[PDB]
Amino acid sequence: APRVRRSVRDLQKRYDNGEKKPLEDLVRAWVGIQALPPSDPKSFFALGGYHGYCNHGNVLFPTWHRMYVYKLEEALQSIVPGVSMPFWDETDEYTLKHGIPSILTQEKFELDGKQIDNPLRSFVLPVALSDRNIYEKPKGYVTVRYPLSGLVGTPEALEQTKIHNAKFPLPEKNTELLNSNVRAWLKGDSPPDPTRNGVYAKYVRCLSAPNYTVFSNTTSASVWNSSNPGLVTPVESPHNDIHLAVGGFDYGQIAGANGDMGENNTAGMDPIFFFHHCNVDRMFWVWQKQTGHTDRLDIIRNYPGTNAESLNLTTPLNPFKKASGEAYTSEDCINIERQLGFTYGPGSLDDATPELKSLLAVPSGNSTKKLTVTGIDRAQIQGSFIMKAYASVTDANGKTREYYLGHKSILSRWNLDIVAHFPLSAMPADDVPKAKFRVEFIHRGGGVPSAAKAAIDKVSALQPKFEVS
């Protein structure tokens, strides 16, 4: 009898009908896990801190994160027995039309007699995150989302942060703009009417991934895309996009809202990290269901994405441990029903419908070909950034049509050749040989005004090379 992870809007539909305990239990557990001292390995602090070990851009991204959510849920169970971590369904109809379920964004919550602060909205750091640096965080820091900023590690950063946050004083309004930035990412244009370019399409496409390796991560998917016709999309890509939106990037040059979800430094101290990751693991389980890999996953030997030591299904996923003291491995969490005792409830995109081929279709007239972008060294850009691609055609008589080709989100950190691929399905096949390509970068611009000039100038010297197939 596996437990059932349900959508959070499901637990909310139960609250709206007077059945309160499901939501209340969950909140109670989160109040629980956030209150444990920092030395407790089940504390929210300890748990979120593990991620600042983790695996991105490699074939353990999905199973490392599967086990990660499972430990958060173990720790919640040490407080309220039998509780399940709900998923934020980011491709459901409510989110396309209204964005984030309000239980994740509400200021307060009715628990026992008491109106308490919502523990799903933010976390207050019990101790500081420092070394002895703009990404560092003082005790008492409260996590923040778009449109606010949380860069507070230097006098300069904190002052610029205050000047930034004082433009957005009303929580009700901040929440509206957040919901509005989330729906725009999802749609891929001005806000359901989804387009081929948004996060919705990227999620739909990753379920078509041909093997686990190119599904698992953006390193493998990018090399596969350099070397196979068509476009494959790793689950990691849309996962990164949700990080940037909550974490401070608009869809519609510098992103000055520096929220915790926007960078790998403290993404894990925001509780929404786990609602989102709980839904990424669900996409992963859905992709296993739909391709028949509920018990067997394969890793292509020597493939890019399979190295840090080769990375294989026996590779430990530190720091997670079985009660033996043995580390978990990817072998230990392929089948979530058999090996971990849980399953997902109903949610968006679990069925392979014909509607979800019409979206990804090359419209009649338009090109089946693909644009590859190279010669980008990201090693010197700091923080996360978005590559937006475009084609402009100059006509027979001086008329320019502009063609938006899509986006690529690089989720990164504050402290390496990058290859992007874009379909040309937005443009009519004729015009492609007659097209001048380019990429706009949206980026953190040093984060503080004292590094803006250096970061903007490294961006302006980028030398991207173009290639149609």
Positive or negative CA dihedral for 58, 237, 90, 115? positive
- 22/48 with CB nearer ligand O: 48
Please state the closest distance from residue 56 (CB atom) to ligand O, in A: 6
Nearest CA among 355, 428, 116, 122 for reference residue 246? 122
- 5/51 with CB nearer ligand O: 51
Please state the closest distance from residue 315 (CB atom) to ligand O, in A: 18
Please state the closest distance from residue 273 (CB atom) to ligand O, in A: 8
Q: Which two tokens stand for residue 382?
A: 């700091």
- 154/264 with CB nearer ligand O: 264
- 31/267 with CB nearer ligand O: 267
Distances (CA, A) of 123 to 159, 166, 197: 22, 21, 33
CB 236 within 8 A of CB 15: no
CB 15 within 8 A of CB 26: no
Show binding-site residues for Cu(2+): 51, 56, 65, 239, 243, 277
Please state the closest distance from residue 162 (CB atom) to ligand O, in A: 28
| Distance separating alpha carbons of residues 467 and 374, to the nearest angstrom | 8
Nearest CA among 243, 276, 274 for reference residue 260? 243
Please state the closest distance from residue 442 (CB atom) to ligand O, in A: 19
Please state the closest distance from residue 255 (CB atom) to ligand O, in A: 18
Nearest CA among 165, 158, 168, 167 for reference residue 447? 158
- 266/367 with CB nearer ligand O: 266
Q: Which two tokens stand for residue 66?
A: 């599967």
CB 86 within 8 A of CB 6: yes
Site for ligand O in 420-449 (CB under 6 A): none
Task: Give the single-character DSSP code of 430.
Answer: G
- 118/412 with CB nearer ligand O: 412
Give CA 418 to chain center in angstroms. 19
CB 360 within 8 A of CB 205: yes
> How many chain residues interact with ligand O (CB under 6 A)?
3
- 9/276 with CB nearer ligand O: 276
Site for ligand O in 20-59 (CB under 6 A): 56
Please state the closest distance from residue 266 (CB atom) to ligand O, in A: 11
Site string for ligand O, 234-273 (x = CB under 6 A): ------------------------------x--x------
CB 383 within 8 A of CB 413: yes
> Any bridge partners for residue 393, and if so which?
401
Positive or negative CA dihedral for 37, 52, 443, 205? negative
For binding to ligand O (CB under 6 A), which residues are involved?
56, 264, 267
